[PDB]
A paper describes a structure:
The nucleosome remodeling and deacetylase (NuRD) complex is a widely conserved transcriptional co-regulator that harbors both nucleosome remodeling and histone deacetylase activities. RbAp46 and RbAp48 (RBBP7/RBBP4) are ∼50-kDa WD-repeat proteins that were first recognized for their ability to bind the tumor suppressor Rb. RbAp48 has the seven-bladed β-propeller fold common to all WD40-repeat proteins but also displays three non-canonical features: an extended loop (the PP loop; Ref. 16) inserted into blade 6, a long additional N-terminal α-helix that contacts blades 6 and 7, and a single turn of C-terminal helix after blade 7. Our structures reveal that the MTA1 peptide binds in an amphipathic α-helical conformation in the groove on RbAp48 formed by these three structural elements.
Pulldown experiments using additional deletion constructs indicated that MTA1-(656–686) was sufficient to bind RbAp48. The shortest fragment of MTA1 capable of pulling down in vitro translated RbAp48 was MTA1-(656–686), and so to understand the mode of binding we crystallized a complex of RbAp48 bound to MTA1-(656–686). Diffraction data were collected to 2.50 Å resolution and indexed in the space group P21. MTA1 was clearly detectable in the histone H4 binding site on RbAp48 in an mFo − DFc difference map. The KRAARR motif of the MTA1 peptide was observed, but residues N-terminal to this sequence (656–672) did not give clear electron density, suggesting that they were not ordered. Two molecules of RbAp48 and two molecules of MTA1 were found in the asymmetric unit of crystals formed from the complexes of RbAp48 and MTA1-(656–686 and 670–711), whereas one molecule of each polypeptide was observed in the asymmetric unit of RbAp48-MTA1-(670–695). Rcryst and Rfree for each of the final refined models were, respectively, 18.2% and 22.5% for RbAp48-MTA1-(656–686), 18.9% and 23.1% for RbAp48-MTA1-(670–695), and 20.6% and 25.9% for RbAp48-MTA1-(670–711). In all cases the data fitted well to a simple 1:1 binding isotherm, and dissociation constants from representative measurements were 2.3 ± 0.3, 0.05 ± 0.007, and 0.24 ± 0.16 μm for MTA1-(656–686), MTA1-(670–695), and MTA1-(670–711), respectively (standard errors from single curve fits are given). Residues Ile-688 and Leu-690 form a hydrophobic cluster with Leu-672. This cluster, which cannot form in the MTA1-(656–686) peptide, interacts with the aromatic side chain of Phe-30 in RbAp48.
Residue numbers in the entry:
A (entry chain A): 3 to 88, 114 to 411
B (entry chain C): 675 to 686
The structure:
């Protein structure tokens, strides 16, 4: 009624007050905080692995794969440059049909970037083969088009041990696999090598294991986590299937230092911790988030550190080494002991984030309002 | 120290 609008107004106040108190506390909570309004909101964020370090400078140049979300206008695949100590610029804009749901670089050659669109084709771009400045026609000339899905989705994951092997999750209940290793010179469209059909609802994410080249995991709106092996001759049924959450599962992340461990994040407002050797039993539930979680990512530097983000506008950082520690009921009120940090700088749903791989503790998070933040919590919070 | 606490209370 006019009650819906009283609620909206109260809620604006709430967000605004929260952002005021956050802003006053920044000098105590961060070693670094940069905020940039992008031209459009980005649904995706990934640091590229390279870092250039010009002579005589007190800063290094890092890079970010980003995207746009615009209804009416021309969308772009984007690469931005960030300066960090020992400011922000766009460097390439590539025409993209529709918004960029996810964009991810191939480890074995990070010029190569795969995207997910609102259409069913999964696109591959080589950004060294497009002009810095996009043709005004607005035509999307991707280097490959990968076929197999019937709908859009998010999950996208390159195999870091088998060059060119890409996995994708879709709203069509399907995971697709491609091998773009070796692609005939007259060939631009590539068909799926395998399609996995074990889910019975929207498949939200997929990821390759980091050491075992055949292994990968998936999560879906059927509330299941599925562990799959590509060596198997049955693609309708995973090696393992667990009932992970009490609502949709949106994300997963394998721990890069602990080969049996992974985390999942869900609309049930939790992150779950898992051990592949025994999937019946969830190891742990990380609770603190107030609404649906969309992204989960392990720290690339510390085996016990994990972070998650989503709809409640927060990005939480966790440390599993503190699970079980006792606490005064005063500390207990703020959250459990494994919650290290609540990033409170965004005033909209967080869509994606990425841990910087060359600068420990630096994270890039992006929200629906068009804000990009590059930040780093204060050292004394994770050390002594 | 209570620098920990502030970290878990960004909105206070």
């Amino acid at each position: 009624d006019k009650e819906a609008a009283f609620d909206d107004a109260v809620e604006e106040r709430v967000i605004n007050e929260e952002y005021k108190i956050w802003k006053k506390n920044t000098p105590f909570l961060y070693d670094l905080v940069m905020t940039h309004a992008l031209e459009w909101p980005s649904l995706t964020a990934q640091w590229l692995p390279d870092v250039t370090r010009p002579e005589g400078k007190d800063f290094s140049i890092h890079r970010l794969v980003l995207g746009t979300h615009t209804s009416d206008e021309q969308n772009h695949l984007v690469i931005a440059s960030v300066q960090l100590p020992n400011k922000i610029e766009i460097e390439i804009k590539i025409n993209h049909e529709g918004e960029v749901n996810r964009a991810r670089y191939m480890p074995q050659n990070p010029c190569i970037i795969a995207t997910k669109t609102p259409s069913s084709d999964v696109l591959v771009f080589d950004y060294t083969k497009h002009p810095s400045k996009p043709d005004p026609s607005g035509e999307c000339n991707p280097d490959l088009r990968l076929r197999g899905h019937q709908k859009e989705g998010y999950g996208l994951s390159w195999n870091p041990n088998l060059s060119g092997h890409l996995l994708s999750a879709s709203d069509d209940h399907t995971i697709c696999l491609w091998d773009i290793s070796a692609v005939p010179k007259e060939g631009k469209v590539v068909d799926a090598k395998t399609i996995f059909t074990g889910h019975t609802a929207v498949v939200e994410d997929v990821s390759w294991h980091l050491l075992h080249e055949s292994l990968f995991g998936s999560v879906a709106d059927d509330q299941k986590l599925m562990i799959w092996d590509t060596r198997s001759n049955n693609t309708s049924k995973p090696s393992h299937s667990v009932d992970a959450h009490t609502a949709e599962v949106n994300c997963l992340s394998f721990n890069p230092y602990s080969e049996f461990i992974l985390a999942t994040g869900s609309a049930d407002k939790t992150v779950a911790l898992w051990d592949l050797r025994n999937l019946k039993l969830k190891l742990h539930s990380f609770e603190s988030h107030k609404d649906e979680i969309f992204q989960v990512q392990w720290s690339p530097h510390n085996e016990t550190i994990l972070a998650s983000s989503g709809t409640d506008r927060r990005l939480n950082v966790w440390d599993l080494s503190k699970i079980g520690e006792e606490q005064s009921p005063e500390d207990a009120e703020d959250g459990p002991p494994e919650l290290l940090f609540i990033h409170g700088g965004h005033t909209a749903k967080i869509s994606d984030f990425s841990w910087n791989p060359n600068e420990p503790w630096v994270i890039c998070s992006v929200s629906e309002d068009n804000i990009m933040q590059v930040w780093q919590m204060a050292e004394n919070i994770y050390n002594d | 120290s209570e620098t920990k606490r502030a970290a878990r209370r960004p909105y206070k």
